[PDB]
């Protein structure tokens, strides 16, 4: 007989498309989430600085009463 290696009835297709999905976002979405996180940080820090100045006024009362 003859037992070389041919392909049996042809083989399949080999792909060559530049497969790129551009999985990302939109610039409006970026700007929205950035401004939202920024405003959240600014508000919470504003409330914390208010509380902190209250406590620093309490330290003022401490040194003012203690002085004589």
């Amino acid at each position: 007989v003859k037992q070389d290696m041919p392909p049996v009835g042809g083989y399949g297709p080999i792909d060559y498309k530049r497969n790129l999905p551009r999985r990302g976002l939109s610039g409006y979405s970026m700007f929205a989430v950035g401004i939202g996180a920024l405003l959240f940080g600014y508000w919470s820090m504003m409330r914390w600085n208010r509380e902190r100045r209250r406590l620093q006024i309490e330290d003022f009362e401490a040194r003012i009463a203690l002085m004589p």
């Binding site: 080999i14 792909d15 060559y16 530049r18 497969n19 790129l20």
Partner: protein, 54 residues
């Protein structure tokens, strides 16, 4: 099959990497007159201008 996938993944990795692109943009410019008379061949002559293939 696997190498078609792997070379798509190399194009995934590099190739619109900002740092590699803007690392190498405008270096090694070769005019076609010089590409002929300086005796370059193959990948250079494909890579600049003339439509030649052995």
């Amino acid at each position: 099959k696997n190498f078609s996938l792997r070379i798509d993944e190399l194009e995934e990795m590099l190739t619109n990497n900002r740092i590699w692109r803007n690392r190498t943009v405008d270096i090694g410019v070769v005019t076609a007159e010089d590409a002929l008379n300086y005796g370059f061949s193959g990948v250079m002559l494909r890579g600049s201008g003339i439509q030649w293939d052995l």
